[PDB]
Ligand binder design. Structure first.
Ligand SMILES: O=S1(=O)C[C@H](O)[C@@H](O)C1
Ligand SMILES: O=S1(=O)C[C@H](O)[C@@H](O)C1
Ligand SMILES: O=S1(=O)C[C@H](O)[C@@H](O)C1
Ligand SMILES: O=S1(=O)C[C@H](O)[C@@H](O)C1
Ligand SMILES: [Zn+2]
Ligand SMILES: [Zn+2]
Lengths: 375, 375
């Protein structure tokens, strides 16, 4: 198996379906990456997450730095041991949570911040981020960038973008300086530029000049609304190299995913299926449902009557309703498993429909049913 | 509150209803005692057992001797701390499980036996049994007797009975020798004599001459069938003192209980509700049901449609079916809670119907419905 090989098997308009081959396994694209945590009794088992169809999971570098720390994870054998997951793992850079969760100092050098847990001091930079992602042992490494809060002025958007591109070169060089990392992992760069077309083009040109294994679209899913997100994708994705994966970070709802694949995105991550499952919300082909609703108390149908997941083969809405209303952790576990599996089945229908040249029809059929809400 | 005061509030034929007042609480009679264990995550919580209506629980001295030992329980504060149960506790003597589970030596002195767990040596006798029950701190203490295996010859029945009566006097004197025990606990004697009327009368006369706070009918529920058990109760219970409680050890099924109250029994214990709940069997007014049966998979009714228990207010047969079939421990916990509560509701209907002078009608109505099995 190679370090990183992206092959496009079929196209329909801007949509693509194919595979990323890595040493730890094959990733089918378009791909949804669930957000991983430590393998403990409070989370789904990794064998359960794999059985839902996930080919790769995501780790948050910022949270792993704060607890238990990347040095400790490295001593435990790396993130694959820590998470009980032997297939590919993508790590984000840590920078987005720095802006939104932590911040002592900020400059072109990097950032110093305090842990929201215990007040300890931590530092991130292109060089430090790549080194920490090396300690975590991840397979896909994200360049460290600077996020611009939403909404952003044209000036703050241009300056964060230009800093992100200098930091993207520094991330590239840091990654290349460690043979063990450069020969075994892959590195993605992140396009910035907010809603501004010339800034997005500037960013894409800089990233393609540096050269990366894949290209992420950053700066979206931060409050802008789906219509504006789609308009930005309309011109932004064609600016990225066609023969490399396109990754939309932090997206999103099922209809966000469908519309983004229509616009050339190959990879997605979101906490939404897990967060919804813990809050008693299930995704279905007829839209999301709130299982606590009284109308489900005697509903013998599964959460979704077409879903193939292990939960829907066995459990009725009525019984999941009973568990959730009682506060039984089993209820949240079943809804979370179903939601992650539903997302993987959405990706599979997307892949199959592109392969057969009927994805445009699938997207229209999907929206008509998802928004009618005849659950 | 007194040490031990039995008051009969109402009678119907041989049936009685009333109260036993003890220092740790009031016991409503006829009473069902669930069999207790240590308060851990593997068992129902003691607050759950109390909420089902139980006024008193039973501890098995033999099992407590083997693990963790009565000395350890005493150091932990006694059985009330160990079991998380601050109301009355009855302990059996240990002797029945010696015959049926353990046996190095046996004589008029007592018995020596080996633990089926670790092979260690233990000793029981009237004096040792009463002392161990003192270490356990129980409120109702059972005299130590000799069980005769079923079926028993007239000779083996007479010799075990006569030994049990000499041991009953020794139990009385041992109990009286410890002021802390004699002033705060109560002591029951056990009638033996197998199916033989003259031996039962001999036994009763000996026990009444010694004098006890209550009188148990031993030697039944060991394979004899309900008809023979009832015939023995017919002549055996009237031999015991009328103004003291009558305790039928190890009984039993709901119809056993009803028929025994018709024959003058005031107290019962059985592992049946707990064993059934762990094996997916629920007691109902229409007879027991096997919840794994396919006919319950979409049955939205509770386990029993008249049962007041917390489980039946919330959970359907369908959902308990789902839990049991999945092997989820919650399923066994819910069925066990329901079964113990059903037993307490049976005792309450028995008490109310005796009070109102309609118990004979209740028993006939109960049998007609319980054995029709229109569940
Ligand atoms: O996403 S997982 O497979 C489930 C749990 O969070 C970890 O074992 C990683
Ligand atoms: O991830 S760590 O172990 C925690 C801290 O930021 C450094 O020690 C690196
Ligand atoms: O019967 S109990 O109340 C439940 C458990 O066995 C112990 O706490 C005693
Ligand atoms: O119950 S015990 O502690 C165990 C053994 O039978 C003696 O030590 C009395
Ligand atoms: Zn499902
Ligand atoms: Zn019930």
């Amino acid at each position: 198996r190679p370090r990183f090989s992206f092959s496009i098997a079929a196209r329909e308009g801007k949509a693509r379906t194919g595979t990323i081959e890595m040493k730890r396994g094959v990733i089918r694209t378009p791909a949804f990456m669930p957000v991983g945590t430590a393998a403990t009794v409070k989370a789904l088992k990794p064998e359960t997450v794999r059985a839902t169809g996930a080919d790769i999971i995501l780790g948050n570098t910022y949270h792993l730095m704060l607890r238990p720390g990347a040095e400790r994870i490295a001593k435990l054998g790396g993130l694959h041991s820590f998470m009980g997951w032997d297939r590919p793992i993508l790590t984000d850079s840590g920078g987005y949570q720095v802006m939104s969760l932590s911040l002592t100092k900020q400059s072109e050098e990097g950032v110093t911040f305090k842990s929201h847990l215990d007040g300890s001091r931590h530092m991130l930079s292109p060089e430090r981020s790549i080194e920490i992602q090396h300690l975590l042992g991840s397979d896909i490494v994200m360049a460290f960038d600077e996020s611009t809060p939403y909404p952003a002025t044209p000036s703050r958007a241009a300056s964060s973008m230009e800093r992100s591109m200098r930091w993207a070169k520094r991330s590239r060089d840091a990654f290349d300086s460690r043979k063990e990392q450069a020969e075994n992992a892959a590195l993605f760069g992140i396009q910035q530029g907010s809603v501004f077309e010339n800034l997005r083009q500037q960013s894409a040109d800089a990233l393609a000049e540096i050269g990366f294994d894949g290209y992420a679209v950053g700066g979206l899913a931060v409050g802008e609304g789906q219509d504006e997100m789609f308009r930005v994708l309309d011109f932004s994705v064609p600016m990225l190299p066609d023969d490399k994966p396109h990754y939309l970070m932090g997206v999103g709802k099922p209809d966000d995913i469908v519309g983004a694949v229509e616009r050339g995105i190959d990879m997605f991550d979101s906490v939404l299926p897990t967060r919804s499952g813990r809050n008693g919300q299930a995704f279905t082909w007829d839209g999301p449902i709130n299982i606590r609703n009284a109308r489900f108390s005697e509903d013998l149908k599964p959460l979704d009557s077409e879903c193939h997941c292990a939960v829907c083969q066995k459990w009725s809405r009525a019984c999941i309703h009973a568990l959730i209303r009682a506060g039984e952790i089993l209820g949240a576990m079943l809804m979370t498993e179903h939601n992650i599996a539903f997302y993987q089945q959405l990706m599979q229908k997307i892949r199959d429909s592109i392969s057969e040249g009927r994805f445009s029809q699938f997207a229209q059929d999907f929206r008509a049913r998802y928004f009618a809400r005849n659950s």
